[PDB]
């Protein structure tokens, strides 16, 4: 077909659907043109070997007020990750300690250096913010030193530095700490409300969606009916000052006044622009790259770790698997774990065969929770890197130096072309809440323009 709308939206992940929702509410027409056979993008619930898994994003935290509002508006309810009993810490030397409380069971020197680092990061985050960290007068100094070098300059304590990196590098940006700047760490902290928020798994990994996070996108997409187009990769955006024509597979052709490119930034150059985007965009987009993390899912006859007095939460910056949590489905009698293998360690596991890789990862899970972790009934690894319409995970960030160099331009419309994804968000950066915020912000921009 060919059709005419106020706004063509490329991508039906949560940012594109949030924008579509808001645009409709204010009386604008939309088409949402989506490449895959489903909506949700980096959120995806599927049944794998008889187990319902959240293959993509899943967690809701208390700072994420725009997602929490939306969940309400869609009739979605939440439940909390299980947290009773003891967590497990694996030291830099490989020693396992069960513990409770807000600090890791390390030697006192490391424990004092960690608290100091956490406080300094909280102070920087509070002063610098997530809206425009590049405009702060500290921006150039912080953005031209890697987070690894900045940590070394702050502290002689190797274990504290490794644990501080655990929460930002493997835990959030999913890139090695040598490869991103101290200002990018500060933005990551500020975006979650504080660095202390990223340290506390009871805050950042607090709740999940009954029904699964993919329902958020599914329900916004339902409300839009035939205005959503699936299995339609956008190939071409012809534009001028008055409008755009979007062309997609299946001979689709949408003529609209504005376009929202609601895709992560590494994928912008998948589309031919006619005329080309400006030099500024051609350069900036090359400096954006997603991280890499394997989300590991292991399903067992029972949550066996609870019988041992454990919450299922483990942290070990020196393990192949640096984080493991109880991810048992709501109302399920079977126990499920989720675990993460980040950046260069994800590279290293993908070099092994799937069978050696599984055994390696399960051996690491057994160091936290015991040998029963090696006998799951369903094992699955999310594999977002293989997916041409994602190509990595959780989210995209600048290379070292790119945030201060290009950050102020990362949300700017090129004439009728607008940009909206979690990867360029302020609060909620890299998460569903940031996709939602950015979709709503882009809608209000377009609305006021009209």
Ligand X SMILES: Cc1cc2nc3c(=O)[nH]c(=O)nc-3n(C[C@H](O)[C@H](O)[C@H](O)COP(=O)(O)OP(=O)(O)OC[C@H]3O[C@@H](n4cnc5c(N)ncnc54)[C@H](O)[C@@H]3O)c2cc1C
Sequence ranges of the binding site for FAD = 15, 34-36, 42, 58-59, 234, 422, 430, 432
Record the tokens describing residue 45, joined without a space: 């619930």
Q: Do 17 and 25 meet the contact criterion of CB atoms below 8 Å apart?
A: no
Interface pick for ligand X out of 9, 395, 426, 446 (rule CB under 6 A): 395
Using CA atoms, how far apart are residues 198 and 184, in angstroms rounded to an integer?
Answer: 14
Using CA atoms, how far apart are residues 374 and 371, in angstroms rounded to an integer?
Answer: 6
Q: Which H helix or E strand runs over 79?
A: strand 78-80
Burial 240-253 (b: 16+ CB within 10 A, else e): eeebbbbbbeeebe
Angle at CA 19, nearest 5°, toward 17 and 24? 95
Is residue 88 involved in binding ligand X (CB under 6 A)? no
Using CA atoms, how far apart are residues 298 and 339, in angstroms rounded to an integer?
Answer: 9
Shortest spacing between CB 92 and its own copies, in angstroms? 6
Interface pick for its own copies out of 6, 143, 159, 423 (rule CB under 8 A): 159
- Binding-site residues for substrate, in ranges, read 340
Is residue 33 involved in binding ligand X (CB under 6 A)? yes
Name the residue nearer to ligand X (CB basis): 164 or 346: 346
Among its own copies, ligand X, none, partner that 107 touches (CB below 5 to 8 angstroms by kind): its own copies
Name the residue nearer to ligand X (CB basis): 271 or 341: 271
Q: Give me the 103-132 binding string for its own copies, x by CB under 8 A, dash otherwise.
A: ----xxxx----------------------
Interface pick for its own copies out of 6, 122, 157, 427 (rule CB under 8 A): 157
Is residue 295 involved in binding ligand X (CB under 6 A)? yes
What sections of 206-342 are H helices per DSSP?
214-224, 279-284
Q: What are phi and psi of 103, to 5 degrees?
A: -125, 155
**Helices 147-154 and 158-165: crossing angle, nearest 10°?**
140
Interface pick for ligand X out of 5, 8, 9, 15 (rule CB under 6 A): 15
Q: Which residues are near ligand X by CB under 6 A?
A: 10-16, 33-36, 41-43, 56-59, 233-234, 262-264, 267, 270-271, 295, 382, 384, 389-390, 393-395, 421-422, 430-433, 435
Q: Which residues are near its own copies by CB under 8 A?
A: 92-93, 107-110, 156-159
């Amino acid at each position: 077909p060919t059709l005419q709308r106020d706004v063509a939206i490329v991508g039906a992940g949560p940012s594109g659907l949030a924008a579509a929702t808001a645009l409709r509410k204010a009386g604008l027409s939309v088409a949402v043109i989506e490449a895959r056979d489903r909506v949700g993008g980096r959120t995806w619930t599927d049944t794998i070997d008889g187990a319902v898994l959240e293959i993509g994003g899943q967690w809701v935290s208390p700072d994420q007020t725009a997602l929490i509002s939306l969940l309400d508006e869609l009739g979605l309810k939440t439940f909390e990750r299980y947290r009773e009993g003891e967590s497990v810490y694996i030291s830099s030397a490989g020693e396992r300690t069960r513990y409770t409380g807000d600090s890791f069971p390390t030697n006192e020197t490391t424990k004092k250096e960690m608290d100091r680092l956490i406080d300094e990061m909280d102070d920087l985050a509070a002063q610098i913010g997530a809206e425009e960290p590049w405009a702060h007068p500290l921006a150039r100094d912080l953005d031209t030193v890697s987070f690894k070098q900045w940590l070394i300059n702050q502290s002689d304590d190797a274990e504290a530095r490794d644990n501080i990196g655990l929460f930002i590098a493997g835990g959030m940006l999913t890139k090695p700490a040598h490869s991103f700047s101290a200002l990018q760490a500060v933005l990551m902290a500020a975006s979650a409300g504080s660095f202390s928020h990223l340290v506390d798994e009871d805050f950042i990994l607090d709740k999940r969606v009954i029904g699964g996070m993919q329902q958020v996108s599914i329900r916004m997409a339902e409300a839009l009916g035939d205005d959503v187009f699936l299995n339609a990769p956008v190939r071409t955006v012809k534009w001028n000052e008055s409008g755009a024509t979007v062309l997609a597979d299946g001979d689709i052709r949408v003529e609209a006044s504005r376009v929202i490119l609601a895709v992560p930034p590494n994928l912008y150059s998948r589309i031919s622009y006619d005329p080309p985007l400006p030099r500024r965009q051609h350069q900036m987009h090359q400096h954006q790259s997603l991280g890499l993390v394997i989300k590991v899912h292991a399903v067992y006859e029972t949550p066996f770790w609870r019988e041992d007095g454990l919450s299922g939460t483990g942290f070990g910056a020196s393990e192949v698997v640096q984080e493991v949590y109880d991810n048992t489905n709501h109302e399920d009698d079977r126990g499920t774990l989720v675990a993460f293998v980040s950046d260069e360690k994800a590279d290293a596991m993908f070099e092994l065969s799937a069978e050696e890789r599984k055994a390696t990862i399960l051996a690491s899970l057994a160091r936290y929770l015991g040998p029963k972790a090696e006998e799951p009934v369903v094992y699955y690894e999310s594999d977002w890197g293989s997916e041409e319409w994602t190509r990595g995970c959780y989210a995209a960030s600048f290379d070292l130096g790119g945030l201060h160099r290009y950050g102020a331009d990362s949300r700017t419309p090129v004439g009728p072309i607008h940009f909206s994804c979690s990867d360029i968000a302020a609060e909620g950066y890299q998460h569903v809440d940031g996709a939602v915020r950015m979709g709503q912000r882009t809608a209000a921009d377009i609305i006021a323009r009209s």
